[PDB]
Design a protein around this ligand. Structure first.
Ligand SMILES: CC1(C)S[C@@H]2[C@H](NC(=O)CCC[C@H](N)C(=O)O)C(=O)N2[C@H]1C(=O)O
Ligand SMILES: [Fe+3]
Length: 329
C-alpha cells in the first residue's frame, strides 16, 4: 500500500506585494513544507495555466517527424553539436514514450557574450517555423518570463524562510544571464504501451522515470491533471496528488548544498501511467558565475564548512550526471 504525501497549498500572492508580515507568514509555510516532504503547491500565482497547457498541446500534436529532426538535440541528431540542452527530445516508438522540447533564456542570442565565448550550458534557442506553428514561439517566450516572475517571488519567500533578506536568492536570478530552462514534456497514451518504456523500481512500482534530485535551485512545475509523482520519505514513496491549477514547487540539490541540507532536495520519481498528459517544468537556475555562500540555519553562528559552488559548474556536472543515472530523455 502507498500513502499520500502532505503537499500544502500555499497562497503565494503576498510575495508580489508590500505587506511584509504577510510575506513572513508565507515564508513560514514554505519553511514548514521544505522541512517536511519538500513539496508544496503555489496557488494564487497569477499565471494563466489554461493557455499554457493549450498552446503546449497543439504544439506536441502538430509537429511532424521532419520538424523533430530539424530541431533535435545532438543526442538524436549528430549534425547539431551545439544543441546539448535546447531543442526537441524525440520519442522512440516501441522503446521510449516521452518526448519533449526544451528552451532557455530568450536573451541568449549570437550577441550574448556567453554565446560569443561558447561558455558551456549557454545555447541559442531553436524554434519551429512560425507559419507551421503560429504564435508558438511568442507564447513560449512570454511564458518563460511569466514563470520567471513567479519564481523570483517564490525565491523571496525561500530567502525570508531561511532568515535572510528577501533578495538573498533573487539577486542572482536575472533576465540577462539566468540558465533557467523550460521543458514542454508530452507523456502519451499508448495502446499497447511498450514494456520497454517502463522501468521497475526496487519496490516494484512501474515507473516512467527513476528516482532523482532536481538539478536546480528550485523547480516550478505545471502538470496536467494526471497523478504520477511520488516523493521519497523515511517510510517510503508517497503519492503527490495532482492539481492542474497550482504550481508544484520543490528545492533542487543546489539549495540542499547551500543550506547544509536544511532544505533537502526531495528525491522523487515519475510513476508509469497510461494517460495522455503534460509536464511543464521550469528549472530555476542562476547565472553561470553565480555563487552563494553556504550557511547552516541549525547553528547559532549560522556557519557552514561547505565550499561555495559556482552555479554554472554545478549545472554542467548535474545535467550530465542525471543523464547517466536516469538515461537520455
Ligand atoms: C519530474 C520532472 C518534472 S523533472 C525530471 C527530469 N529532469 C530532467 O531531465 C532535467 C532537464 C534539464 C533540461 N533539459 C535543461 O537543459 O535545463 C525530467 O524531464 N523529468 C520530469 C518528468 O518526467 O516529469
Ligand atoms: Fe524532478
Amino acid at each position: 500500500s502507498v500513502s499520500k504525501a502532505n503537499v500544502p497549498k500555499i497562497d503565494v500572492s503576498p510575495l508580489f506585494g508590500d505587506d511584509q508580515a504577510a510575506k513572513m507568514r508565507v515564508a513560514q509555510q514554505i519553511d514548514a513544507a521544505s522541512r517536511d516532504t519538500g513539496f508544496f503547491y503555489a496557488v494564487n500565482h497569477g499565471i494563466n495555466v489554461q493557455r499554457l497547457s493549450q498552446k503546449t498541446k497543439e504544439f506536441h500534436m502538430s509537429i511532424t517527424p521532419e520538424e523533430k529532426w530539424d530541431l533535435a538535440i545532438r543526442a538524436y541528431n549528430k549534425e547539431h553539436q551545439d544543441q546539448v540542452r535546447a531543442g526537441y527530445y524525440l520519442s522512440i516508438p516501441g522503446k521510449k514514450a516521452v518526448e519533449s522540447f526544451c528552451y532557455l533564456n530568450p536573451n541568449f542570442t549570437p550577441d550574448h557574450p556567453r554565446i560569443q565565448a561558447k561558455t558551456p550550458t549557454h545555447e541559442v534557442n531553436v524554434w519551429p517555423d512560425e507559419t507551421k506553428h503560429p504564435g508558438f514561439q511568442d507564447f513560449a517566450e512570454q511564458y518563460y518570463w511569466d514563470v520567471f516572475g513567479l519564481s523570483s517571488a517564490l525565491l523571496k519567500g525561500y530567502a525570508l524562510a531561511l532568515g535572510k533578506e528577501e533578495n538573498f536568492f533573487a539577486r542572482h536570478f536575472k533576465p540577462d544571464d539566468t540558465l533557467a530552462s523550460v521543458v514542454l514534456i508530452r507523456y502519451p497514451y499508448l495502446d499497447p504501451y511498450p514494456e520497454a518504456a517502463i522501468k521497475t523500481a526496487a519496490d516494484g512500482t512501474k515507473l516512467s522515470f527513476e528516482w532523482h534530485e532536481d538539478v536546480s535551485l528550485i523547480t516550478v512545475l505545471y502538470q496536467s491533471n494526471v497523478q504520477n509523482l511520488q516523493v521519497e520519505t523515511a517510510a517510503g514513496y508517497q503519492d503527490i496528488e495532482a492539481d492542474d491549477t497550482g504550481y508544484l514547487i520543490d528545492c533542487g540539490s543546489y539549495m540542499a548544498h547551500l543550506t547544509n541540507n536544511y532544505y533537502k532536495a526531495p528525491i522523487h520519481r515519475v510513476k508509469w501511467v497510461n494517460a495522455e498528459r503534460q509536464s511543464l517544468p521550469f528549472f530555476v537556475n542562476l547565472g553561470y558565475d553565480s555563487v552563494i555562500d553556504p550557511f547552516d540555519p541549525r547553528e547559532p553562528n549560522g556557519k557552514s564548512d561547505r565550499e561555495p559552488l559556482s552555479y554554472g559548474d554545478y549545472l554542467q556536472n548535474g545535467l550530465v550526471s542525471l543523464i547517466n543515472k536516469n538515461g537520455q530523455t
